[PDB]
Structure 1
């Protein structure tokens, strides 16, 4: 294939980096201006132009323009300046982009499956032109973090996340399939817009909803394979969580809100445990929240303790949960689900009404907040920890920032800089009155999903075990240098997310083979060389035909 098509296909288009010989031999001569440049100077021109613009939204449009024009240039510039541009391509900007610029550019990307297509979903899946899809990321656009129900404009989130699959772990773009399921929207801003690109109905919440996600799962799987990696993104928590439970064993699926959070959470505790060298039986964890997030993080703490010499039942007894109804204790007015049982214990003689009370009586070394209620780590709660512990561990994991349990500012000032703090929220550094400055711990799911996704795909793995995320957690924290642990870092620098994501992938690859969950044989002797060699790269290929004389 030669001529114009080479230029209109972003997967092969090199633009001005088309060699003179390439332009002449492939019939491009005259279709480009008469000047050869390299990926280097192409990339340099873009970085320079991005430095002139200041709006994140404007940066999104500019860089997503390239992704449609020149695939390899897009992933060069993305990887050149990854810490700055991960927040532009993905959260928080992608959500802001979808909402505002859905109606104006109207450029279709990925696959749209509406409830109108019940019974014929296989035939919609058959229209996707790529034959070896390895990674599917799907949304119904119900809960875009910090905006809400954006309907089909949700498509932007799977696209953005897949960009990071490629940028961070070098997963092949052609092997990725962003999907948007349209069951309606509850947002009258969209239902009353004559220019809305989605179905004009309230979200279908009937059995037809559950049957369509079922049909989609079957359909993707029947074309691409049983081992096809599937993530649900910005679904309603109730849907996302019950779907993880329904499909986790039948399909190759994992969920960032539960399992990525658990890996990122544990990674941070493990980092905290390297500076504070506090012994295993000196440990007691108290959760604000007892939902799927708490259960997921808790499960992974239990499993970590069991690998370090404790017993499942010993590890469990070091973990307490406090939900809406208060502390979770054997025999109480409020419900206790059978997944919560393992962390529901015999009451201590004092029973608390507030979380503050619960801290004072239990005296935990670590509080983890996953309630999504708001500032429930109140100064009295933060103050009480500083009192009970030399170095208290305070994780305010609830997102977004409004829902977070406490700020970095109020966490560090009220413990006079002695707490080991992490959040999902982006808090800036905080300056105490003695002069010294604290940069808080920022837990980010991008630490986990790229490396995990790459290992599962490269191994042809069909089931993602809890131990994957355990192994992910250890792999992340094992990359913190002794110099970095002394400066109070709980998480590697995002600038190194590539090296980080690949080492996690090598270590999960090692785990999946060692435990007979890989189907890619023969098994490699060296798992490092196996992955470092199957990563997609942004360097331009030669498209030059091989001309040579005959001796």
Structure 2
């Protein structure tokens, strides 16, 4: 397409970076100021304006707005300092954006499929402009981070996730599709909000819901292909597992909250063990919460131990869980589903009432917070872990920051710098009164899904086994340098997320081929070069037509 439309499409718009020749040949002459700018000048304009802003939400509106104006510049900007912008485009600010989605709305992003569209989903999928989608991130908005049911306001999550697909792993933006499934919401506040972007009805929990998701999976793969990567994000607990189980063998799909989180957590644990070097037999892990993340992390931890000697049965016995009804013990009054059974032990001597009791009675060496319900890791809980363990492992992975089990300051201070801490949301360095400085790592699935998605896409993988995430876990931790470990970091610096994601992708691609799970042919000889050659770049491409003379 030529003319104004080239400027209206954020995918092709270069702003004043369009060269003189491009302008004349594409009919843009006169529609742009005379000045020919470079991407560097455009980036500078951005940083100057960003520096003058105050609130994170304001910055989020500004930068995400660039994605709808100049895609290339949008990614160039993220690439310039991914670390300082992560908190704005991702957790915790993204949580704030979703809560306010209907208030800040300007332009829609992604595909919206509602229960009222049942029987016509394919027609909706055919309306999406892009023809070669390779990655889809879908949500129904029932479990947005630890914020709860946000309905269609949850679309901000898939959009954010996909920006990271590109920013971190170089996956082509035009081949990503954010999707929001709208079947209603139980959030009473939103049902009375005049700005709400979804259907004004309670969540439809009948078979019609399952039917809609089925129709969706089918319509997506019918248009784009059976190996289209489909990432399930922020679905309620019940639906998450059953959809994963029902589809992981029929489509190329995975759940970021169960599997991606499982892998980053494991990566962090493997790094801690590298410092503590505790006898595999003396491992005792207590989970605060027993849902998507807990069960995901537990299963991956068991796989790591089994491949290290222990049997599945003896590894599962070293893992305990404590949910909103209390410790998961056999015969407890509160439900116990099939996924939890393997981690449901026989009631101890005395049944703990609070999590603090659980810590003093079970005496775990590791504590992992994934309840998404706030400061459950109280000062007493942390003090107990420091008195029981010389180097207690404390993970507070719930997002956003307000839902975190505890802060980095609390963890380091209350344990006198002896803990190995990690959190889902960002926290700056902590300096103790004695002068020691601790730099906490972020155990967030952003370190995993980008690299894994790229490998799966590049290898034309049909299904994703759980052993893939185990490998990604190992690839992530294998990049941690001893110097970073010394600082208190259990994960590679966020500043190097680009490189780290590519290395994870390279390792996973090698794994996929070696295990006959890759169908891209021919098999590349040098997997590293294969991956690096296919990463999308934020540098502008020439849009000039191929002119040359005939000899």
Q: Out of 153-162 and 472-481, give the one that drifted further.
A: 153-162
Report the CA distance shift for 1:35/1:284 in structure 2 as closer, same or farther (over 3 A).
same
Q: Secondary structure at the match of 1:161?
A: helix
TM-score (norm 1): 0.93
Superposition deviation, residue 506 in structure 1:
0.8
Instruction: Tell me by how many angstroms 1:172 deviates.
Output: 0.8
SS at match of 1:254: strand
Q: How big is the shift at 1:354?
A: 4.0
Moved more, 518-527 or 179-188: 179-188
Structure 2 unpaired stretches of 5+: none
Structure 1 residue 84, shift from structure 2 partner? 1.7
Which runs of 5 or more residues in structure 1 are unaligned? none
SS, match of residue 196 in structure 1: coil
Partner of 2:132: 132
1:171 aligned counterpart, secondary structure:
coil
Alpha carbons of 1:172 and 1:329: their partners in 2 closer, same or farther (altered >3 Å)?
A: same
Partner Cα distance (1:374, 1:7) in 2: 45
Question: Cα distance, 1:329 vs. partner?
Answer: 4.4
The change in CA–CA distance for 1:330 and 1:494 in structure 2 (over 3 A counts) is same
- 1:122 Cα deviation from its structure 2 partner: 0.9
Is structure 2 residue 294 aligned with structure 1 residue 300? no
- Cα distance change on mapping 1:454 and 1:436 into 2, 3 Å: same
TM-superposition CA deviations, 1:484-520 (whole Å, max 9, x none): 1122211111111100111111111111111111121
| 1:227-266 Cα deviation digits (max 9, x unpaired) | 1111233333333333223322222222222112211111
**CA pair 119-428 structure 1, distance change in 2 beyond 3 A:** same
d(CA) in 2 for partners of 1:192, 1:332: 39
Give 1:370 shift. Answer: 2.5
In 2, Cα distance between equivalents of 1:360 and 1:187: 37
Tell me, in whole angstroms, the C-alpha distance in 2 between the residues paired with 1:122 and 1:510.
35
SS of residue paired to 1:23: helix
Give 1:445 deviation, angstroms.
Answer: 1.5
Contact 2:98 2:156 in 1 (8 A): yes
Aligned residues: 551
Alpha carbons of 1:88 and 1:350: their partners in 2 closer, same or farther (altered >3 Å)?
closer
SS in structure 2 at match of 1:51 = helix
SS at match of 1:498: helix
Q: Are residues 227 and 361 of structure 1, via their aligned partners in 2, closer, same or farther at CA, if it must alter by over 3 Å? A: same
> Structure 1 residues 549, 524: closer, same or farther in 2, change over 3 A?
closer
Is this contact kept in 2: 1:86–1:164, CA < 8 A? no
Structure 1 residue 215: Cα displacement: 1.0
Q: 1:7 to 1:115 in 2, by over 3 A?
A: same
C-alpha separation between the residues in 2 aligned to 1:96 and 1:371? 19
Q: Distance in 2 between matches of 1:333 and 1:8?
A: 60
Q: Which moved more, 1:518-527 or 1:202-211?
A: 202-211
Deviates more, 1:299-308 or 1:426-435: 426-435
Alpha-carbon deviation of 1:331? 5.3
Instruction: Give the C-alpha shift of residue 432 in structure 1.
Output: 2.8
Shift of 1:325: 5.0
SS at match of 1:359: helix
Q: Is the 8 A contact 1:480 1:491 kept in 2?
A: yes
Change in 2 beyond 3 A, CA 1:357/1:466? same
TM-score (norm 2): 0.93
Deviation larger for 360-369 or 189-198? 189-198
Q: CA deviation at 1:10?
A: 2.1
For residue 285 of structure 1, report the CA deviation from its aligned partner.
Answer: 1.9
C-alpha RMSD of the superposition: 2.4
Q: Return closer, same or farther for 1:415/1:456 CA change in 2, 3 Å cut-off.
A: same
Task: Give the secondary-structure state (helix, strand or coil) at the position aligned to 2:356.
Answer: helix
Measure, in 2, the Cα distance between the counterparts of 1:313 and 1:197. 48
